[PDB]
């Protein structure tokens, strides 16, 4: 099995490189690489650096 925490879900491309309000720049957890596991939601940004809930950008 394979499960997420809050503000993130699986993905099948998307890179260890995770976005943040930092970023805000992809609509993905990161875009350089396809990994099969979680990421933030598709227009979110995981809060900070490395957080475990992802805010959006008009939040951030």
Do not use: Y
Not at 39 to 51: N, Q, Y
Not at 54 to 59: A, D, G, L
């Amino acid at each position: 099995n394979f499960v997420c925490p809050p503000g993130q879900t699986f993905q099948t491309c998307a890179s260890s490189c995770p976005k943040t309000c930092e970023t805000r720049n992809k609509l993905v957890l990161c875009d350089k690489k396809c990994n099969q596991r979680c990421g933030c939601i598709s227009g979110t940004v995981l809060k900070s650096k490395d957080s475990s809930e992802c805010v959006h950008p008009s939040k951030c």
